[PDB]
Design an enzyme around this catalytic site. Structure first.
Site, PDB file in Angstrom:
ATOM      1  N   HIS A  19       0.832  -1.224   0.000  1.00 29.02           N
ATOM      2  CA  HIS A  19       0.000   0.000   0.000  1.00 29.02           C
ATOM      3  C   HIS A  19       0.866   1.273   0.000  1.00 29.02           C
ATOM      4  CE1 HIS A  19      -2.834  -2.861   2.040  1.00 29.02           C
ATOM      5  NE2 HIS A  19      -3.694  -2.252   1.234  1.00 29.02           N
ATOM      6  N   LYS A  43     -18.357  -5.734   8.187  1.00 28.34           N
ATOM      7  CA  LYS A  43     -17.201  -6.480   7.621  1.00 28.34           C
ATOM      8  C   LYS A  43     -16.371  -7.092   8.763  1.00 28.34           C
ATOM      9  CE  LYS A  43     -13.957  -6.281   3.787  1.00 28.34           C
ATOM     10  NZ  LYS A  43     -12.801  -6.901   4.487  1.00 28.34           N
ATOM     11  N   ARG A  92      -2.141  -6.930  -9.245  1.00 30.79           N
ATOM     12  CA  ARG A  92      -0.985  -7.873  -9.019  1.00 30.79           C
ATOM     13  C   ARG A  92      -1.329  -9.363  -9.263  1.00 30.79           C
ATOM     14  NH1 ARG A  92      -3.283  -8.035  -3.672  1.00 30.79           N
ATOM     15  NH2 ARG A  92      -1.533  -9.372  -3.075  1.00 30.79           N
ATOM     16  N   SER A 130      -2.748  -8.429   2.684  1.00 30.94           N
ATOM     17  CA  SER A 130      -3.198  -8.061   4.046  1.00 30.94           C
ATOM     18  C   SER A 130      -3.643  -9.320   4.828  1.00 30.94           C
ATOM     19  CB  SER A 130      -4.303  -7.004   3.991  1.00 30.94           C
ATOM     20  OG  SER A 130      -3.826  -5.669   4.219  1.00 30.94           O
TER      21      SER A 130
END
Ligand SMILES: CC(C)(COP(=O)(O)OP(=O)(O)OC[C@H]1O[C@@H](n2cnc3c(N)ncnc32)[C@H](O)[C@@H]1O)[C@@H](O)C(=O)NCCC(=O)NCCS
Ligand SMILES: [Mg+2]
Length: 163
Positions: A19, A43, A92, A130
């Site tokens: 990031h 979430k 990616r 992450s």
């Protein structure tokens, strides 16, 4: 030739060297970059909005054209509200890539001014997820290579209050 303002939304739970790469790169080519942390009520993340923005501010504050905000609701509305030029996303892996299209194309239907623009991170930050970081951290593994030092400490302090 107005000023340009890109929004870089994410849950940043936590922010990662990847990031940081992306934001740095973006800051070089747009006037303002807005790191936008998705609150994500329904979430259920590992670090609070406050930890998340803090750690972000900690890793990217030294950039004069980066801001940090929390937001929820509809990205399209956030976009409108912030009078943004475009939304920044990184590319990616490969399943990312076809969701990113859905996202871009759906949002363009909601708001014809919507616009997504994609950077690619340094090859050394391409594997990092992450999610994968949390799992490694969660098992007392060394995530120093993958995340900034504040995040390392944050993981340790999360262990200190049981984890
Ligand atoms: C949080 C959002 C942006 C999705 O991102 P995500 O939850 O995957 O969190 P993350 O913090 O990992 O996202 C950061 C962004 O950078 C890229 N990225 C993530 N990790 C890395 C890395 N290590 N290296 C390079 N790029 C990366 C991703 O492609 C992503 O675009 C999503 O929740 C959002 O709000 N988008 C809008 C969703 C939408 O339109 N839904 C319908 C109404 S909102
Ligand atoms: Mg990620």
């Amino acid at each position: 030739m107005s000023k340009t303002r890109v929004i870089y939304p994410g849950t940043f739970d936590p922010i990662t060297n990847g990031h940081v790469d992306l934001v740095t790169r973006a800051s070089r080519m747009f006037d303002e970059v807005v790191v936008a942390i998705a609150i994500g009520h329904h979430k259920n993340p590992l670090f609070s909005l406050e930890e998340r923005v803090a750690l972000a501010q900690s890793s990217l504050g030294h950039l004069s054209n980066v801001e940090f905000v929390g937001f929820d609701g509809l990205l399209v509305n956030f976009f409108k509200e912030q009078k943004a030029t475009a939304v920044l996303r990184g590319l990616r892996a490969v399943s990312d890539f076809e969701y990113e299209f859905q996202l871009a194309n759906m949002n363009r239907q909601l708001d014809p001014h919507f616009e997504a623009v994609f950077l690619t991170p340094s090859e050394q930050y391409s594997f990092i997820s992450s999610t994968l970081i949390r799992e490694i951290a969660r098992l007392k593994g060394d995530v120093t290579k993958f995340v900034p030092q504040a995040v390392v400490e944050a993981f340790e302090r999360k262990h200190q209050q049981g984890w």
